[PDB]
Each structure stands twice: as structure tokens, then as C-alpha cells.
Design a protein around this ligand. Structure first.
Ligand SMILES: [Cl-]
Ligand SMILES: [Cl-]
Length: 268
């Protein structure tokens, strides 16, 4: 039986090459993708053997889509060994915000809130799984400033457009969303590593500098290889453990972000 890994944003770039790399290593990859036609065309284009993957629809910008993806994944009756949170959207040219179907600024909604709900659901699957080397890997880098999370505290609906409640800036929204991903990785480790035995880490595979194929191989190493079986660290390129920024290592802020995010995604 092929061990199962879910990869978000698997239809292109690093996620697609991570899919190829893990398939080559004998895994079965759930390509969780927002466009099924594009994803199937991309997997066939890379010559991935059909036995080694399943494409399922996931639009991280819609919380109902996240829940529907989890439903579809669970219906396959495959125990989960790993999850890679790789998808990231970026809208450099916006001067005014775009809101998701759930009412949230799209960059944070997609990169952070959608992944946050996905993680909270799939953590159940990871805990239930009899696999012994289970990992949840978040892509990220370790300017963004979440402030006191005033935008989240007040509900994050229009006209709020930034986590700190200040005026919309699209590039900063992206950086803020990536910082949220890093804070999520740290909080996952703090709260769950000892109780579950799951390895919760993050990685920056390089400026994609490095080819998409090499970056995908680096994702695969962090998911699968024994040298990377350490929880609570951020791997960067040999690989090294990268010391965290002060804001990414703020334990109080990571916990408060988690609590507010649960409220925004309907888990509170
Ligand atoms: Cl744009
Ligand atoms: Cl605009």
C-alpha cells in the first residue's frame, strides 16, 4: 500500500513537482486543487502514473470548499500519513481588497484561513491514522506585522482588510498571511507534538535560484526522509534549521491567532 499525502496547490509549481517527487518515491498523492481540468492536464503532462495520484477539488478561498474537499478525501478510505500546505496566492497589483465568498480579504482568507480550517479537520485524520511517521509540513519563510490582531478581533469582514486593522496593502497582506502560516506551524508543534507524535514543521525550499523540480524534491525530503524527522523546526536551504524571527516565535501571538482563526472559520 502506498502511503498517502495531501498536497495543496498541487497543479503547478512547487506543489506539482512535490507531487511528482513523492509519487516517484512510492507515495499516493492527493492533489488538492482548485481547477480539476488544469490539475489533470498538469499531472498527465508530468507523466505521473495514475495509480500514484487522485485529484480532488479544493478552493482554499471558500470554507465550504475546504469542508467538501475533506468530505471527498475521507470518502476514499485511505489513511493519511502527511499533509503539505503549499498553496499560496498573491495579488501584487490590487489597490482595493477582494473579498472571498465568506467575506474575508482574499490573500489572508486563502493562504491562512482556508489552510487553518483544512489543518484543523485533517489533524483528525492524522491522529486516527495508524501510520507511525506522520508529518504536517507548512511552506513558508521566516514587513509583516499582525499588530494586536484587531482586524481578526473585530470579525475580519468588510471593510476590514488587514489582520492588524489598518488600511489594505496587498503585498503586506501576502507577507502577513505567510507569517500566519509560520505561527500556525509553531502552535501546532507546541500544542500537539507531544500528545500526538505527529511531526509539525515548516520549510523554505529556496527562491523558485532553485528550479521548481529541486524545490519539489526538497518538499519531498521534509515529508518523507528520516533526517527531517524533527518537530518544531523550520528547514531552509545542506538543509539547516533556521532560527525564527521574533514575531514568528511569539508564543502568545501564535495562540491568540489560533483562537481568533477558529472563530473566523466556524470552529469556535
Ligand atoms: Cl494582482
Ligand atoms: Cl484594485
Amino acid at each position: 500500500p502506498r502511503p498517502t499525502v495531501i498536497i495543496t496547490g498541487a497543479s503547478s509549481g512547487v506543489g506539482l513537482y512535490a507531487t511528482k517527487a513523492l509519487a516517484n518515491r512510492g507515495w499516493h498523492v492527493i492533489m488538492a486543487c482548485r481547477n480539476l481540468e488544469k490539475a489533470e492536464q498538469a499531472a498527465k503532462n508530468l507523466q505521473i502514473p495514475p495509480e500514484a495520484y487522485t485529484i480532488l477539488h479544493l478552493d482554499l478561498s471558500s470554507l465550504a470548499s475546504v469542508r467538501g474537499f475533506v468530505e471527498s478525501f475521507r470518502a476514499l478510505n485511505r489513511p493519511l500519513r502527511a499533509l503539505v500546505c503549499n498553496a499560496a496566492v498573491y495579488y501584487p497589483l490590487l489597490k482595493e481588497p477582494i473579498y472571498s465568498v465568506d467575506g474575508y480579504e482574499i490573500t489572508v482568507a486563502t493562504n491562512h484561513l482556508g489552510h487553518f480550517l483544512l489543518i484543523n479537520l485533517l489533524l483528525e485524520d492524522l491522529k486516527n491514522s495508524p501510520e507511525s511517521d506522520k508529518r504536517l509540513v507548512i511552506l513558508g519563510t521566516v514587513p509583516p506585522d499582525l499588530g494586536n490582531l484587531e482586524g481578526f478581533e473585530k470579525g475580519f469582514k468588510k471593510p476590514i482588510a488587514m489582520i492588524n486593522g489598518k488600511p489594505f496593502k496587498s503585498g503586506k497582506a501576502y507577507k502577513d498571511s505567510k507569517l500566519c502560516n509560520m505561527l500556525t506551524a509553531r502552535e501546532l508543534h507546541r500544542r500537539f507534538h507531544e500528545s500526538t507524535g505527529i511531526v509539525f514543521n515548516s520549510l523554505y525550499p529556496g527562491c523558485v535560484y532553485v528550479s521548481q523540480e529541486l524545490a519539489g524534491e526538497r518538499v519531498a525530503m521534509v515529508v518523507a526522509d528520516p533526517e527531517f524527522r524533527q518537530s518544531g523546526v523550520h528547514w531552509s536551504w545542506k538543509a539547516f534549521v533556521q532560527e525564527l524571527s521574533a514575531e514568528a516565535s511569539d508564543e502568545q501571538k501564535a495562540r491568540r491567532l489560533w483562537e481568533l482563526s477558529e472563530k473566523l472559520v466556524g470552529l469556535a
